[PDB]
Design a protein around this ligand. Structure first.
Ligand SMILES: C[C@@H]1CC[C@@]2(OC1)O[C@H]1[C@@H](O)[C@H]3[C@@H]4CC[C@H]5C[C@@H](O[C@@H]6O[C@H](CO)[C@H](O[C@@H]7O[C@H](CO)[C@@H](O)[C@H](O[C@@H]8OC[C@@H](O)[C@H](O)[C@H]8O)[C@H]7O[C@@H]7O[C@H](CO)[C@H](O)[C@H](O[C@@H]8O[C@H](CO)[C@@H](O)[C@H](O)[C@H]8O)[C@H]7O)[C@H](O)[C@H]6O)[C@H](O)C[C@]5(C)[C@H]4CC[C@]3(C)[C@H]1[C@@H]2C
Ligand SMILES: CCOc1cc(CC(=O)N[C@@H](CC(C)C)c2ccccc2N2CCCCC2)ccc1C(=O)O
Length: 671
């Protein structure tokens, strides 16, 4: 047992301090199934299975509702403990904007004490938030173990009269949707509370104009939900053509010998290219919806701030905009963004796992070179336009946030220039979104065409030596990755890095002394990031590689069920399944603990940054520039952990482009 998360004092339970030792070891020598621990007794497949079966007996003494109530009876204590942590973290995160309000109101007219209390509340709030995430993940994984064991125990008893692939994917995707509903279940209860208290605080701060602002920002959640629905629709319509193109590529690759013998390769390649053109026609709509999602997500808050402040000053002829009031409202808008954006995802996952539990009831009742090659496939025109648009968009963003400070203290001219710059910002953001999506599409097209052509020209000895599985897998999974994940992830990594650099630039321009303190933290940040990455890579690979046995086992058990029951070998196979699912659970649990460790450390670095910025700016001013620095240093932590998550998410996905280009360089016959 090397997963001693339950077995430490509450502080290291809260800051995942034990993981430190592990991660340090995991940096020197690679991670093996001997280095990762064995799960505690509290979280085993047998322990959670027996807990769930006791809950099921209790519910049967008193269908889908039966399964939901049994899952409640079995995991509700920990589910509501995670929900408590999450709601306390939500309220203590709201404790930030009003504190910025108090600080800027003091110094524009008790300030240092407000700054240190902001620091303390921020530190405690981020710790509680990460602990909430962790408890939700742990109870979700325990539920996955119990449900896997239960559906396997049901596979054992079912009759020979009865769909093996259905059971295999019921273990593969339906239990997954259930576990992810349990991952996001605290959010389902704590996002409405968050949004309500946010709108209430905004109203209390800004009078009546804040309600117009909060309505405009809330108008983001339904639009995001509609966009996500259209995106899944386009996803299915793309998967159709992708499956047909895959079958055609498999035809071309099985009979490559005969084709090359009579030189029919070019005509079959042309047919595959026609199918690829149809799939690209569908991918265009998919990318349009993805671009609309990115643009709405970034542009609804800009317009919300614009309408709020302008209508507050001109239309309402309302209170004069003071720095404290304005920047408190801005911080509350930034705190309001994320719940409004992710509420659609929470609801969609909720209905998805509801369907999954209904189905389970019905069943149970019976790499820099890769980046260089990818960017070079785009061309200098699209790459230059993309980089210029990203940089100028973030410049316009910081520009409007600074014009806010200069606004606070000819008010018509200020309002007009603020409106002009917000329009410039939304146009520039739409440009950067459409450009990243167009670049993604163009690179996918070029890379796929070159790959197909370069394996058409491949010699026969190459095909005899190379496994057919790999040549098909490059077109099957990696071209899919380049088609779907690389555009969005590259765009979001660009946004995360540029927003982080922008925030540090803002709080350095407000506070010239913070720069001196930036370099230590910078170093710390770097180190942590580095170590996390290596650990997070190993674990991730391990977590994937242990899932293939499990599903495989399920498949086998469904195929040779009558033989296993004839042998009376049922207990041995249930034992093998418990061992496989325990390997998978320990892998996923250590992966999530490493994630929690990194996000806790990055949030603590963000807390130190906000404390330094608050202290030094309140000092130098003892006005609106202090509020600017305060907001940006307040939220640097999100940019930081989002950017490191996106970098980890970026390298793995870029490995696919790397190996596509690797296969692209095979020898060609001088035809
Ligand atoms: C410009 C102004 C305005 C305000 C602001 O700055 C200043 O601008 C805001 C900007 O907008 C920012 C947001 C941009 C949008 C960002 C969205 C991001 O979540 C999105 O992106 C992924 C980030 O990790 C999520 O997670 C998925 O990420 C991918 C891998 O990393 C996969 O797509 C999937 O993997 C999993 O998929 C499910 C399978 O079962 C698993 O095996 C598998 O590992 C993951 O997970 C998602 O997968 C979904 C599949 O349907 C499931 O529902 C659920 O799992 C989860 O959802 C995904 O879910 C979701 O789409 C969130 O993390 C941060 C985010 C919000 C940002 C936070 C900070 C802001 C808000 C910024 C800030 C205030
Ligand atoms: C903050 C990321 O850590 C997690 C967090 C969770 C639980 C969780 O409340 N998630 C929120 C995101 C946070 C920022 C609110 C969420 C809500 C809706 C849809 C997706 C998501 N997401 C979950 C996948 C990655 C981020 C978007 C699970 C798993 C993880 C994880 O380490 O993988």
């Amino acid at each position: 047992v090397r997963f001693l998360q339950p077995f430490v004092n509450l502080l290291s339970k809260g800051t995942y301090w034990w993981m430190n030792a592990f991660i340090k070891t995991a940096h020197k020598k690679p991670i093996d199934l001997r280095a990762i621990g064995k799960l505690p007794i509290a979280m085993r497949a047998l322990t959670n299975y027996q807990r769930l079966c006791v809950a099921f007996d209790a519910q049967a003494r008193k269908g889908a509702r039966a399964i939901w109530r049994a899952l409640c009876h079995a995991f509700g204590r920990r589910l509501i403990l995670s929900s408590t942590f999450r709601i306390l973290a939500d309220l203590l995160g709201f404790a930030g904007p009003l504190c910025i309000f108090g600080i800027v109101d003091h110094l524009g007219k008790n300030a240092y004490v407000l700054a240190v209390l902001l620091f303390l509340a921020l530190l405690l709030q981020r710790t509680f938030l990460q602990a909430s995430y962790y408890v939700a993940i742990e109870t979700g994984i325990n539920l996955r173990g119990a449900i896997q064991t239960k559906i396997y125990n049901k596979i054992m008893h079912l009759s020979t009269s009865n769909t093996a692939g259905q059971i295999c994917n019921l273990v593969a995707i339906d239990t997954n949707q259930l576990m992810w509903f349990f991952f996001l279940c605290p959010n389902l209860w704590a996002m409405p509370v968050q949004i309500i208290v946010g709108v209430i605080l905004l109203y209390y701060i800004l009078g009546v104009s804040a309600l117009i602002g909060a309505a405009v920002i809330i108008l983001l959640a339904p639009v995001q939900y509609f966009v996500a629905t259209k995106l899944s629709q386009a996803q299915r319509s793309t998967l159709e053509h992708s499956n047909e193109r895959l079958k055609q590529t498999n035809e071309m690759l099985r009979g490559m010998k005969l084709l090359k013998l009579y030189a029919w390769e070019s005509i079959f390649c042309s047919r595959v290219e026609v199918t690829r053109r149809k799939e690209m026609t569908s991918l265009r709509a998919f990318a349009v919806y993805t671009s609309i999602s990115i643009f709405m997500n970034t542009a609804i808050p800009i317009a919300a701030v614009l309408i709020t402040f302008v209508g507050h000053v001109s239309f309402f002829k309302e209170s004069d905009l003071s720095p404290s009031v304005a920047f408190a409202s801005l911080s509350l808008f930034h705190i309001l963004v994320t719940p409004l954006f992710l509420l659609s995802s929470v609801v969609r996952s909720t209905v998805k796992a509801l369907v999954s539990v209904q189905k389970l009831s019905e069943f149970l009742s019976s790499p820099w070179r890769a980046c260089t090659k990818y960017l070079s496939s785009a061309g200098i025109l699209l790459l230059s336009l993309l980089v210029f648009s990203q940089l100028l968009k973030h410049m316009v963003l910081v520009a409007i946030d600074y014009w806010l400070a200069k606004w606070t203290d000819d008010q018509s001219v200020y309002a007009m220039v603020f409106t002009l710059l917000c329009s410039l910002g939304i146009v520039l953001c739409l440009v950067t979104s459409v450009t990243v999506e167009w670049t993604g599409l163009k690179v996918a097209k070029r890379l796929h065409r070159s790959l197909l052509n370069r394996i058409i020209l491949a010699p026969m000895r190459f095909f005899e030596t190379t496994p057919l599985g790999s040549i098909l897998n490059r077109f099957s999974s990696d071209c899919n990755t380049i088609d779907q994940h690389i555009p969005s992830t590259l765009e979001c990594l660009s946004r995360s890095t540029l927003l982080c650099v922008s925030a540090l630039t803002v709080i350095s321009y407000v506070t010239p002394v913070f720069l001196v303190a930036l370099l230590p933290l910078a170093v710390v940040c770097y180190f942590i990031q580095k170590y996390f990455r290596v650990a997070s890579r190993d674990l991730q690979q391990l977590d994937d590689t242990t899932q293939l046995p499990l599903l495989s086992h399920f498949a086998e058990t469904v195929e040779g069920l009558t033989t296993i029951r004839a042998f009376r070998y049922e207990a041995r196979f249930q034992q093998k399944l418990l061992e496989y699912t325990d390997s998978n659970n320990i892998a996923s649990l250590f992966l999530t603990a490493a994630n929690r460790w990194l996000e806790v450390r990055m949030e603590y670095i963000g807390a130190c940054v906000v404390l330094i910025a608050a202290a030094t700016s309140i000092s130098n001013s003892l006005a609106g520039l202090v509020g600017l620095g305060l907001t940006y240093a307040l939220m640097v932590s999100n940019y930081l952990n989002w950017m490191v998550r996106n970098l980890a998410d970026m390298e793995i996905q870029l490995g696919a482009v790397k190996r596509i280009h690797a296969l692209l360089k095979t020898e060609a016959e001088s035809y």
